[PDB]
Design a protein around this ligand. Sequence first.
Ligand SMILES: [Fe+3]
Ligand SMILES: [Fe+3]
Ligand SMILES: [Fe+3]
Ligand SMILES: [Fe+3]
Ligand SMILES: [Zn+2]
Ligand SMILES: [Zn+2]
Lengths: 354, 354, 354, 354
Amino acid sequence: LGTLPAPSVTTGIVDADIHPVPQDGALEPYLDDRWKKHIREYGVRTTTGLQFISEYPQMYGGAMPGSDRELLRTQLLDKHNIQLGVLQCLAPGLNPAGQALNQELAAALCRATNDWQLEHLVYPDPRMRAAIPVTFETPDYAVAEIERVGADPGVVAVLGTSKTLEPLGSRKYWPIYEASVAQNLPIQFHLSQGGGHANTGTGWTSYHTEYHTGHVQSFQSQLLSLVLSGTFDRFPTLKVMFVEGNVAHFAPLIQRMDYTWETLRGELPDLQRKPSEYIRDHIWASTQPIDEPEKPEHLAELLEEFCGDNVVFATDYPHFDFDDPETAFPRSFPVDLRDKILRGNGMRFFGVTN
Amino acid sequence: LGTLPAPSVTTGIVDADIHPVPQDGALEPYLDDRWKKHIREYGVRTTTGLQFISEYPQMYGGAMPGSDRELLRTQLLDKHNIQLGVLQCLAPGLNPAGQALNQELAAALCRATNDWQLEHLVYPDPRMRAAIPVTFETPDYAVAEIERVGADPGVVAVLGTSKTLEPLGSRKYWPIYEASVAQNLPIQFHLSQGGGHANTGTGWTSYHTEYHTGHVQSFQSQLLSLVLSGTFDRFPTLKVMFVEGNVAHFAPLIQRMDYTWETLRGELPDLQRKPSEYIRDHIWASTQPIDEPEKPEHLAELLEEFCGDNVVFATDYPHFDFDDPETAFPRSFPVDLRDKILRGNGMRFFGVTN
Amino acid sequence: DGVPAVVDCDVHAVLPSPHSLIPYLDEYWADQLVAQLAPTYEPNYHPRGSAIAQHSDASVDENGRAATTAENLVKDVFADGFTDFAVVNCLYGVQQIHQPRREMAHARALNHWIANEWLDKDDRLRASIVVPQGSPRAAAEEIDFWSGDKRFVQVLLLGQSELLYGREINWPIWEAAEAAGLPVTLHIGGVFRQAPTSVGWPASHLEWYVGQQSNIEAQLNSIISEGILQKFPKTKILLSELGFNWLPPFMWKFDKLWKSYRPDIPWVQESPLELIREHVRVTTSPSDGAEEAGRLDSIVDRLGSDRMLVYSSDYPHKHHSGPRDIENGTHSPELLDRIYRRNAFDLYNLVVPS
Amino acid sequence: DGVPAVVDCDVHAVLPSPHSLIPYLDEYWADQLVAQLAPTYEPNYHPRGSAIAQHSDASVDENGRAATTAENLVKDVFADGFTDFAVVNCLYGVQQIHQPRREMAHARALNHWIANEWLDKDDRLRASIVVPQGSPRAAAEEIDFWSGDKRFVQVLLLGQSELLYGREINWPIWEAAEAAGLPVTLHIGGVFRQAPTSVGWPASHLEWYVGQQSNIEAQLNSIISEGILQKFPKTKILLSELGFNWLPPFMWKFDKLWKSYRPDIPWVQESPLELIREHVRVTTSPSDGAEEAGRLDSIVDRLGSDRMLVYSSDYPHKHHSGPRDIENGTHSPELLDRIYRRNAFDLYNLVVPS
Ligand SMILES: [Fe+3]
Ligand SMILES: [Fe+3]
Ligand SMILES: [Fe+3]
Ligand SMILES: [Fe+3]
Ligand SMILES: [Zn+2]
Ligand SMILES: [Zn+2]
């Protein structure tokens, strides 16, 4: 690695969610041989009884400088004037690194991935920056990794998963937030599987409609926890973003939260503010996959009802449901709202100076 | 509190599990009014949807100085020459204090209980000592409580529950072990409910036979975790005892463990010893409810097969299935084994000098 | 013909004590109950001391409790003459009895208590059939059993179940409800046999209560995706005390993913948008902010149907907003007439008596 | 009459790939599978690279894998002439397909692959019926379907299920097995729809593998307590690759608690001690230390019956001890004759052919 400038966004856009198309032995020069042998013998054991796949496969997933950079440069970065593209590598290669039941292996794989995306994508083309995967279920290792590479300017955020063993407001994770706030880093939680419980609070889903729609639910529960535990009283500078868990649903969820709090606030007397008052400074959300109301004017209504300043654009390239910054919004969409979704809102979240 | 001597056991016996029959307002002089009001409004929320009871009631539970001391003195301590009676108060009053989903409440209730059993039972009759309940699911609070009262000579152990959110070998609990080893305290894990998962690894039990027999299973899983995580490599002085999770089953479980390890040890290369080799210095177990083989000579066989030095007597007074130090063993039982179950084995576990 | 009546679609009878079921139990279960020390399955859905438990204005019994007698309930619910009928839901926690035969017996006893002590005492009262959710075939027999008593107007289920209600093992309930001509309602509350969220246990009653909307999204997706509405085309679903403002973003996403995945659930040939609009109804208390100026008009608009909301007071629970405050959120007398009379007529067929 | 044959009660066919099921699928499911990028449900019960996966001595295919063809399996299993029949279990993870109709279709295809590619190729082979565990009524139909082919000799279930196998929703399997005259086996492996232990997720394959004996205690208690043996009195159960040395302490405790709780399960009038001895059989590989001097005699003695153990090699898995090393643990030729021939005759009725 040489040296990098802080990210810059002027007339291009922010893209919060990009999944770098990796390569096979790519991680092997960053893994010690202990874990090479261990992976050769056991794979990456997770919250399944499956040797290779996750509990909910995709049902059609697959298509198509050097490695994979030129395609990313020309298909995505050049094509869409992306000045800040945040890389979110959850699979070595499709289960999250941090979710490996062997947590020492998981931290080795997290380490290998961070060294790899930095050297191979960010530093060669610093329009891309990394959200570094860490082992959220072993805070000690995650703190160590945030300290190892978090201060590098190639790193713009800490990367977690929507599904966890305890809700993200639980004290188990406060050391990770404390380390993040020390590195001046925000945290992104990506839609994921696993985590240790069923994919809903009331059983496992059957068909692909329940599975993929169900992903918003984990996010609904993580917002409630993070807010009503007082996590944002303890860490008043912490910014978190929910990624690929759509946006519009958060608005009626927060609306219900305040409504119930008006009656039951006595249960949580240390909570310093009204619950919806924490959204502005602490909770962002990315757009992909965009919400598609029957009447398209409802989209801008609900995004503003969540918070118009805290919604950030993402492509989710190269997934099948990827969003295009042109096509994704309806044509009556307010121009000022769209512009700050593309530029300003992400700029504030990631800390890039105007 | 005045001052106390270290416990002394000469010709009497050790009783590892005694449940002090508490009183209603007893904890109120040790609870701040915040939690008084909070308990008045919400009870003690736990891993159920039940306002008062636990998910598996007893189906016949109930019977019958000052408060409750004289009955304990004369019915139990005097009657059985008990020189070291370890108090294990899991209910304020029957769900464990530490298991309260409001963990701040749970630490307040743990605090209130520790101050109460110390002042009300131990110091008035120091034949009784306390195993102090802590909040195992919030290590920070549990460390704080081990440091607040753990050095008091009225305290002989740290008290936990058989059911936990993660297996006890998980790093989540290592700060608690580190604090315990610093206070020169062993840890007792009592049979419990709750913990956050079903009462077996494959669903919830239906009838009372499955429920009460099923309690050994949680212990089987906690032994495997505690040993195969290398927890006893990291804390080579740590002693833990499984309480009211019978004894005999541990022997074939450990036997299977070594057998499987002979083939799959490669998965865990940092593990310093053969798995059964950790039993001697780290794993004890209490006797109640005594195992009752069809051929009574199998009892001594299996206790020795677990480890003859690590089995400790307990009455579980005043529960219905309580054991009598006379009646509990069969008459062919080897006299030397019985004597150290009554005296020496517990003496070593609790650190009372010969 | 005739004018559809104003039906209060959700009010509660509070069982004074488990003792109240003894008259309706067989001698076997009566002995079990008396021998068990009569453990109460009073739920924690509305903690008896919390602000949501009861109104300050409510009629109470000698122990300060609201809604434990029909006399107290009728005196409050009907006092102003606006309501013609109230649908009674008793949420006593028989669904949390783990012993399957005891769950059967207490559920039948609870229904007997409702018939004789509530429905018999006032002909303006109706009720739902509490069912033993743990054994669907037995729940179907409990529905058949009461199908002959037209005062029982719907089938009661909890928002959180053991397996999602679309799973085939749950079809006997849907079939039996359809053959009895009864809507199935889902009321907030759960069996608590997994963590109430896909990311673990919520730490406060407040957090649990707001978040239960997530489980209802999972249930509606399970019910529709698995084919319940094609298999049982006359099924009606009522969501009781579960909010409604979360519905539109859920419906939009579900419809988006149904189009992307139609071959995976070929039995689903109508749009989930339309199925939900035609088959799902929702009570109005709590209103969760829909009572503010224009917000009722906005939500109906986003819902895409004025036939979904049915009036309820949720007596005797206290909410930030009162049973008739929804009028401040609409300017359309026609909409208010559908919420008070016309929509509930689709569920119960109750015309104003004389 | 005739001499009962030496039956190897547990050997494995390894599905080479999900592609191998395409010939047996309907065009609907074949398209789904081809479109899905053919995700493989190869389990992690025996990680393909781990030491337990296969013997060094084993016949392999062009990819180094053992037991993917009948030709390789027959060549090893029967090479020395000692075995007359082998019962084939394919553990390909169709039970972990969450889509219930796809689970049905792949289970039937797997059984078709077994019949045509294994049972057809050699008449010394038998198999179990893989069943769609997620829909018990469909699993009963899968049993009915193959009941006409006497080469299928037992019903395959995993040690870990979604709900315990005594629960009423699972009775269609017990009924169908009984009507087909087939024993039900439980083989190590799980659906992984809750944590594999009551205290959470085990961190290594080793820890998971040893601990699965705990789930089998929960299953045997569920099956007996709920009345399966009274309801289906001819039921036979085989425990496959699950150890046996844990049985006696479990049986003693279960019997103790049955006596203390007989009115709670009145259908259980025989002692669980006797029921287990009469209805449960257990394969001998792994032996878990029973192969050491005297240990086979000791365990039979503790078991209280010489009719429970049946011979198995567990081909092609590697265990610390070999299929016939159990002879070093007994001095009784009569016992060895029951383990090799007489006990399995209770399951399959296989006499030595000519
Ligand atoms: Fe993404
Ligand atoms: Fe994506
Ligand atoms: Fe006890
Ligand atoms: Fe006890
Ligand atoms: Zn209600
Ligand atoms: Zn096997």
